[PDB]
């Protein structure tokens, strides 16, 4: 009945009411509307490094959704350099308690949609999708790349393009949760993103 511009590329704000916690105010920018599940949006919220998947129009936790008129920037950066980081295993330095710089092994997956000066990155010990302006880490010397790496993703078993196909995650407690493959990483074709129904995060998996 209607064909319209979607909200990908727009700035948004909305309340977030969950459990018994008080209401917070979220602001972010919509990166993608998932083709295989168009109720699902991928959002980078401000002040949150982890990328969220939310059914913005259906999720009861999302209150008074509003599209902001604010425009998204296209910052000046070394493009070839940015491209050269894609697919690289890295050692990413973070600040640890109590005074200890920590090295997190990670894998740069892609330049993010919409905010293309930011990078999709996941970590071996924390295999969900994160987003940073990595060139500022690399310039500050907090990003060492590992040209010859042995990187481990969590494994997804099969049983033929997988995006759009459903999964179950069988937990150690014997319970299961449902999800679906929403993305195949262009630079790393055996690596996929999965969204579980019961969880906000975007999970990064590899195929055998």
């Amino acid at each position: 009945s209607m064909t319209r511009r979607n909200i990908v590329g727009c700035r948004i704000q909305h309340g977030w009411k969950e459990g018994n916690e008080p209401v917070e105010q979220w602001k972010g920018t919509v990166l993608e509307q998932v083709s295989v599940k168009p109720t699902l949006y991928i959002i980078k919220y401000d002040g949150k490094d982890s990328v969220y998947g939310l059914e913005l129009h259906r999720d009861k936790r999302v209150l008074a959704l509003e599209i902001l008129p604010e425009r998204v920037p296209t910052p000046r950066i070394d493009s070839r350099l940015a491209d050269s980081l894609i697919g690289k295993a890295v050692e990413h330095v973070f600040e640890g308690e109590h005074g200890t710089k920590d090295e997190w092994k990670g894998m740069v997956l892609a330049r993010a949609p919409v905010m293309d000066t930011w990078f999709y990155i996941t970590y071996e010990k924390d295999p969900v999708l994160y987003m940073y302006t990595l060139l500022d880490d690399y310039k500050d010397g907090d990003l060492r790349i590992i040209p010859d790496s042995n990187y481990y993703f969590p494994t997804a078993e099969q049983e033929d393009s997988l995006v759009g196909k459903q999964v179950e995650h069988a937990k150690d407690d014997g319970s299961k949760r449902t999800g679906i493959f929403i993305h195949q990483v262009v630079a790393k074709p055996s690596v996929y993103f999965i969204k579980f129904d019961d969880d906000i995060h975007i999970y990064v998996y590899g195929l055998v």
């Binding site: 330095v93 600040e95 907090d142």
Partner: peptide
């Protein structure tokens, strides 16, 4: 240098 959040 980045802070790691929960």
């Amino acid at each position: 240098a980045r802070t790691k959040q929960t």
